[PDB]
Amino acid sequence: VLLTNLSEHMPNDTRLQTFLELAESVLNYFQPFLGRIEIMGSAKRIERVYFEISESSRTQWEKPQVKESKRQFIFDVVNEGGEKEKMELFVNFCEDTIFEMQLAAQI
Amino acid sequence: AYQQKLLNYFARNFYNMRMLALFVAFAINFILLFYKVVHYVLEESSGYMEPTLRILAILHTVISFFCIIGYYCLKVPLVIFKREKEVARKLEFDGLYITEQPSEDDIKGQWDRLVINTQSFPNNYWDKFVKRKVMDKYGEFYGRDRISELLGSAVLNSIDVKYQMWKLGVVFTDNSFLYLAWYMTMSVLGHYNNFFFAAHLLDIAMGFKTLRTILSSVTHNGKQLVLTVGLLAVVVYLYTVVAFNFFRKFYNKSEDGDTPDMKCDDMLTCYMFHMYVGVRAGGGIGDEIEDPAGDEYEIYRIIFDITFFFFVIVILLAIIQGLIIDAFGELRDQQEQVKEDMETKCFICGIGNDYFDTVPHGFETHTLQEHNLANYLFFLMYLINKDETEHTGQESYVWKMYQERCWEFFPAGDCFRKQYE
Amino acid sequence: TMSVLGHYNNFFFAAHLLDIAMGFKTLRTILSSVTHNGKQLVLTVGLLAVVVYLYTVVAFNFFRKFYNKSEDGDTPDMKCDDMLTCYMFHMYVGVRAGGGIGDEIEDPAGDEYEIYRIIFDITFFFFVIVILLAIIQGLIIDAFG
Amino acid sequence: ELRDQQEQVKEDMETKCFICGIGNDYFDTVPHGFETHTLQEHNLANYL
Numbered sequence A: 001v002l003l004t005n006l007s008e009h010m011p012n013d014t015r016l017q018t019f020l021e022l023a024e025s026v027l028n029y030f031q032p033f034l035g036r037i038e039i040m041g042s043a044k045r046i047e048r049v050y051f052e053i054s055e056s057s058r059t060q061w062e063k064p065q066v067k068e069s070k071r072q073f074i075f076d077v078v079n080e081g082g083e084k085e086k087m088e089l090f091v092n093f094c095e096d097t098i099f100e101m102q103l104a105a106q107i
Numbered sequence B: 001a002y003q004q005k006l007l008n009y010f011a012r013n014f015y016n017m018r019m020l021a022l023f024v025a026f027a028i029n030f031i032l033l034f035y036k037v038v039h040y041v042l043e044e045s046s047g048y049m050e051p052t053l054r055i056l057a058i059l060h061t062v063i064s065f066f067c068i069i070g071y072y073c074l075k076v077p078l079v080i081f082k083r084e085k086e087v088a089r090k091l092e093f094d095g096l097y098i099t100e101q102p103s104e105d106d107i108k109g110q111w112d113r114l115v116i117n118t119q120s121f122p123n124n125y126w127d128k129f130v131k132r133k134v135m136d137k138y139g140e141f142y143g144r145d146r147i148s149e150l151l152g153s154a155v156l157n158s159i160d161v162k163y164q165m166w167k168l169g170v171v172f173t174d175n176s177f178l179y180l181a182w183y184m185t186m187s188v189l190g191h192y193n194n195f196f197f198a199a200h201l202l203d204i205a206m207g208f209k210t211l212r213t214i215l216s217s218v219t220h221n222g223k224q225l226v227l228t229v230g231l232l233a234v235v236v237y238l239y240t241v242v243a244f245n246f247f248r249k250f251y252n253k254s255e256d257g258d259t260p261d262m263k264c265d266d267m268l269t270c271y272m273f274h275m276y277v278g279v280r281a282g283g284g285i286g287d288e289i290e291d292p293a294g295d296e297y298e299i300y301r302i303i304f305d306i307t308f309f310f311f312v313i314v315i316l317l318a319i320i321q322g323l324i325i326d327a328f329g330e331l332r333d334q335q336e337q338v339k340e341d342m343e344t345k346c347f348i349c350g351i352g353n354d355y356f357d358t359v360p361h362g363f364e365t366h367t368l369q370e371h372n373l374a375n376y377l378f379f380l381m382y383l384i385n386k387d388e389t390e391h392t393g394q395e396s397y398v399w400k401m402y403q404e405r406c407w408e409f410f411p412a413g414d415c416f417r418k419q420y421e
Numbered sequence C: 001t002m003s004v005l006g007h008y009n010n011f012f013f014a015a016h017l018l019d020i021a022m023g024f025k026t027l028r029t030i031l032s033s034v035t036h037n038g039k040q041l042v043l044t045v046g047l048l049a050v051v052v053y054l055y056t057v058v059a060f061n062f063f064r065k066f067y068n069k070s071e072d073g074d075t076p077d078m079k080c081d082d083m084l085t086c087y088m089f090h091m092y093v094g095v096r097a098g099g100g101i102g103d104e105i106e107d108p109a110g111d112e113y114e115i116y117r118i119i120f121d122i123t124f125f126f127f128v129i130v131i132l133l134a135i136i137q138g139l140i141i142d143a144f145g
Numbered sequence D: 001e002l003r004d005q006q007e008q009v010k011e012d013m014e015t016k017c018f019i020c021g022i023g024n025d026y027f028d029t030v031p032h033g034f035e036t037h038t039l040q041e042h043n044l045a046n047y048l
Ligand SMILES: Cn1c(=O)c2c(ncn2C)n(C)c1=O
Pocket: A098, B125, B126, B127, B384
């Protein structure tokens, strides 16, 4: 996740870029595992910060019983709503999603 | 011995439980075509099918009971988790039961005027320290020891009592729970009688949703359709004055007069007659009435027929049909509108489908990577997982932003391609 | 194999004329205007079936005297007092009714349950004749658009 | 016709402003702006 952030912050190299193609296979093993999001971390600009995806929890997410509620939620938010708390609605939506996956782990 | 061990199985197949539960109801209602009158049961087959009917009439019922069991596992407290989260954060930000004391309405909310004092208050939500936290938000202002006290085998009396009663009082106020409870009361009567007991088949209106396109294509527009009923009623309430004041000789439901010749010379009677006949007419009310062949008011009679022939038969038929087909076009346009707005520019930055595919094959990957909406949820799992002692400044930062319930950090118009050149 | 039967028999041998459905494509606009929407149209058939499967319980439990396909009773007076029989009867008649099922049934002129009979006619008169006709037509014209 | 006319009117109210009438997107280029841009910069009853 370090060296990918080096790639992301610094593309347009050669010596890094040949090191970026040096030996990168577990790299490709590492892509259920790393999350890449895009925030503004009070930098008054974007921040592309990365982190780990617990793939066991992500498999716990991979079932439906939620994905249609997800798409339902999609229809809801594009349908109408106060247009700023729609992210807040997404927060609550996520919190309940957490509750769902938490309760469906023990199955 | 097996109690909570098998408990996961019930919600674990609860949807398939529901599917087979509705699957039984066909073969329930199927056999009643083989009826005969008194009530006779015909079996033109292997004659043990009637004892298997006697079996299945209660087998379906205990299936539905097991469906309510698996539901009582499944779509239970997550809803009251939401309700509890809601009321907790609203007393937190607001102190509604302390400072505001809401009105006679919100019976759902006023029900939670009785959960304020309850002991294991977020029994499945988060944490009870928020109670002491909002005591410190408000008790120094108004009452410190007052409002805190306002909050607060061998299983002999160690239970949540009134919290549990509040929980149930919320629990009763559910659509689908009451739907299935009503379905259980529907399935009761196999032990009682199959008068209405095979009539479970309403459940297709919530089983498959493919049909619900049609039902929604009705049900949003019905608020005018009841008014169509009303205007029908009043225009025939008009028409029943006319011949009642002017063509009672043209009333004749008589069997050719030599019988006790029948003419509705009461306003209500001819009204109900037009309702029964002239509504179901098709060919016009002049079909089922005295034709004129020389009357003084023959042309009045004819023009009355013509005005009926148009204004009922043409008009209101066309009204209901055109309502339905504009309802069709409305719902289809709405659906594909939603589809387009999903498939345009992003949800999160939401700038241009063209714009992040200015570079080819970008925008979909720009979605799948720069916005990838489930990953923000994953990130919240990541944050709520670990400890702030090990947060980075971004991590602790946005953690605190969420702690503030603020949400400013999301990208408005300012993606990474947008950030640079 | 359709054209085989000229040596055999013109029972179905002159019935080759389905081939217009793939010969000219000008007509296939219409057939496509049906065929993409038929996946709900079979469900329209199903809901028809079950609402008349409902309606055939009602008078069968409550208006068997109002059943009469009798030739005025002096004949071996005909009333479908079996659920399947009156079901198929509504299917044959009340579907093809137009004027309502109260047309082809005993009218009441003084019954205890006369108003129940009347309101049963009215609910039929709407919910079949108006509604499902309009359903299929509106399905077709939104399919057009 | 009548439904399209009605929702057309609705959209044109809910697009860009009445007064400046520039861009619903444009005064919500900054987030949560355009509605407040209406409610403050144009706030049509306030001119009355
Ligand atoms: C207890 N608790 C929390 O306190 C919490 C949370 N998510 C956010 N918070 C703040 N979750 C999932 C949680 O279980």
